[PDB]
Design a protein around this ligand. Structure first.
Ligand code: HEM
Length: 311
């Protein structure tokens, strides 16, 4: 495993965020493939250039390919072990939808100008062969809190744990240092949420609001977000890297969280998601999912194979 050959899957969610889902036109496979191959080279060149121009601005990029896109572009080729089509989850109280999509970009920087420029330069190659599925603009709230006012990402794995849980190792050697990324846009019912007491919100989440100290298990609701969202199969505490992001039009009162979770194992994310939706996570009473798809995030070297037309 070498995290230096990974895309930016494992660390910084960033002060200014852009999320873009595209579909391929499915009009001319050859020409569409040719433009994805150009894009695999150009996207790295664009990051190099902006990192030269703005080295203090923490530019981070992750770009992804869905199962459907992979089957259409690379029909003759190997496929990452756990790459599948997400079609939604049938839950108890609540369902989650699946969204058809082919390409994903998660762009983060200290300034919105750099997130604008990455996408504007990439779309010179990709606009003639795509349509937009979703485009969301996100930001870091005060003290890295989610827009609901609780600290976002405290139980994320960090340093060696982030590598361990974030990127593909020797189990799938063709695609080592890749990642599986699940994108899921939620709208919040901020009015209802704001009418709860602090203590009522703390029951929903499983932690104290101001200090962010985890509640003692004796005091938690068993449907609290930080209980049901876990994957503890086989007495192992499975992790992914969550870099969740507020988005808002606060004039219109349209506010939400765009979930983005990077894992070595799609199987772990999918299990956490199944647990939430079958056991009725309390946070789902204030959170309505409106899209969702999973993408494979290639390593640097997999991008180089794609650019050189090996798949
Ligand atoms: C509206 C969407 C979401 C919001 C606002 C949200 C918010 C939070 C908050 C505030 C925490 C506690 C701080 C922390 O340890 O990070 C947390 C923890 C967590 N969330 Fe979420 N979350 C959302 C969606 C999801 C989704 C879709 C998943 C899984 C697919 C997930 C999995 C987790 C996990 C595993 C933890 C850590 C629990 C622990 O080990 O204590 N969350 N989330």
């Amino acid at each position: 495993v070498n995290p230096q050959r990974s895309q930016d899957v494992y660390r910084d969610a960033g002060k200014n965020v852009l999320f873009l889902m595209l579909s391929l036109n499915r009009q001319d496979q050859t020409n569409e493939k040719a433009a994805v191959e150009e894009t695999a080279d150009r996207l790295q060149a664009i990051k190099r250039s902006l990192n030269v121009r703005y080295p203090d601005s923490h530019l981070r990029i992750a770009c992804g390919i869905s199962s459907k896109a992979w089957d259409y572009l690379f029909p003759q080729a190997p496929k990452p072990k756990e790459l599948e089509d997400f079609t939604g989850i049938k839950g108890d109280k609540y369902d989650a939808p699946g969204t058809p999509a082919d390409l994903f970009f998660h762009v983060r920087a200290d300034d919105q100008s750099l997130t604008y420029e990455v996408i504007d330069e990439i779309m010179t190659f990709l606009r003639p062969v795509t349509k937009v599925v979703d485009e969301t603009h996100g930001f870091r709230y005060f003290e890295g809190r989610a827009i609901i006012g609780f600290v976002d990402g405290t139980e994320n794995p960090v340093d060696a744990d982030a590598v361990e849980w974030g990127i593909i190792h020797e189990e799938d050697p063709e695609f080592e240092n890749g990642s599986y990324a699940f994108a899921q846009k939620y709208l919040h019912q901020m009015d209802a949420w704001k009418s709860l007491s602090t203590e009522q919100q703390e029951q929903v989440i499983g932690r104290r609001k101001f200090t962010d100290l985890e509640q003692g298990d004796e005091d938690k609701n068993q449907r609290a977000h930080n209980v049901v969202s876990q994957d503890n199969r086989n007495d192992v505490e499975h992790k992914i890297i969550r870099m969740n992001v507020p988005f808002s039009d606060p004039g219109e009162n349209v506010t939400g969280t765009y979930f983005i979770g990077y894992g070595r194992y799609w199987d772990v994310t999918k299990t956490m998601l199944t647990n939430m939706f079958t056991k009725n996570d309390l946070l789902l009473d204030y959170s309505t999912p409106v899209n969702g798809q999973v993408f494979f995030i290639p390593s640097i070297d997999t991008l180089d194979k794609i650019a050189d037309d090996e798949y």
